[PDB]
């Protein structure tokens, strides 16, 4: 069984690998298909154990990955796309 201290530390507001959907971040890429369609990004996740608080990023950054783009009938290739990672997270009022 997981000790309260661990359960507590492990779920407390912090940057955790999140599988983020690309069309999500780039809502403008309507006509593109990506492979992968989602990327592994550091993102603020966890709890504050306070109804009035919320986990938010205090320090952001950018990560660049090779994403294959595909525009049906037009072209297909891999290349570089950049995404926002969260480096610091903090519980702040809402």
């Amino acid at each position, epitope marked *: 069984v997981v000790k309260f201290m661990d359960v507590y530390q492990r779920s407390y507001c912090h940057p955790i690998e999140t599988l983020v959907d690309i069309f999500q971040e780039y809502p403008d890429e309507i006509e*593109y298909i990506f*492979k992968p369609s989602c990327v592994p990004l550091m993102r603020c996740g966890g709890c504050c154990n306070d109804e009035g608080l919320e986990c938010v990023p205090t320090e952001e950054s950018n990560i660049t990955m090779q994403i*294959m*783009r*595909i*525009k*049906p*009938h*037009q*072209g*297909q*290739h*891999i*290349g*570089e*796309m*950049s995404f926002l990672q969260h480096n610091k997270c903090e519980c702040r009022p809402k």
Partner: antibody, heavy 123, light 108 residues
Framework: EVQLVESGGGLVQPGGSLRLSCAAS????????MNWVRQAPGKGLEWVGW????????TYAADFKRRFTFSLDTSKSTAYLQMNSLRAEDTAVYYC????????????????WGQGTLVTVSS | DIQLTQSPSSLSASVGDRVTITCSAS??????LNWYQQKPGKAPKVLIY???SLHSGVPSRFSGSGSGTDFTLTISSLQPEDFATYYCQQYSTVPWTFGQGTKVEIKR
């Protein structure tokens, strides 16, 4: 180093068929689409179409869907262009050319080309 | 099919001269135009894409500009090795199309 090596060109009788191969090397064949361009002797460049090497889907410029067919054998990193019912006007140097690695956004230009092979249709 | 018309069709200029070649599209194509240099017996080689991005490895004397339906390729200082035929290519709407080519000859 990236390179495209085409073969299968040559003499063909009017009405005949011919298959050209484009052999890729020095990169991952399935990560970039393959285009086909032809240039009649002393003339301009004409885009024939392209094929998605990840999914297999071919897209042809209108005048070619009828007699030409694009295919691939990813296991050999090779794209093929099958031509049927050739006529004298099909006489040309045929090139295969891969799409480029992009930065942030996509631009459909051909960055590496094969050396081209002359297909001459005649009896 | 979008029609690309270049001009002039050919030209002769001296080493050191500034050469400008023109591409005119039959309809707006935004900045979706590329330029290629083709030397005798070789495949065309991309000089510029997206109207003005200089492809890596291409001498900076080559430059491109324009938009809408009018574009321009410029060689600031013609070198002996710039003898070739230059083509523009739109990627606005399939099928991709090319201009008829401009042959550039060196005058000496």
């Amino acid at each position: 180093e990236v390179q495209l090596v085409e073969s299968g060109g040559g003499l063909v009788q009017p009405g005949g068929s011919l298959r050209l191969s484009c052999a890729a090397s020095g990169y991952d064949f399935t990560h970039y689409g393959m285009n086909w361009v032809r240039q009649a002797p002393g003339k301009g460049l004409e885009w024939v179409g392209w094929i998605n090497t990840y999914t297999g889907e071919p897209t042809y410029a209108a005048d070619f869907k009828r007699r030409f067919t694009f295919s691939l054998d990813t296991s050999k990193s090779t794209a093929y262009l099958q031509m049927n019912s050739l006529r004298a006007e099909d006489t040309a140097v045929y090139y295969c050319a891969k799409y480029p690695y992009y930065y942030g956004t996509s631009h459909w230009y051909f960055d590496v080309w094969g050396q081209g092979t002359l297909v001459t249709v005649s009896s | 099919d979008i029609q690309l018309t270049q001009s002039p069709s050919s030209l002769s200029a001296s080493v050191g001269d500034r050469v400008t070649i023109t591409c005119s599209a039959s309809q707006d194509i935004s900045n979706y135009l590329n330029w290629y240099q083709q030397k005798p017996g070789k495949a065309p080689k991309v000089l510029i894409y997206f109207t003005s991005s200089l492809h890596s490895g291409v001498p900076s004397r080559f430059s491109g500009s324009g938009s809408g339906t009018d574009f321009t390729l410029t060689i600031s200082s013609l070198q002996p090795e710039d003898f070739a035929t230059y083509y523009c290519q739109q990627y606005s709407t399939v099928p991709w199309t090319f201009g008829q080519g401009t042959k550039v000859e060196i005058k000496r």
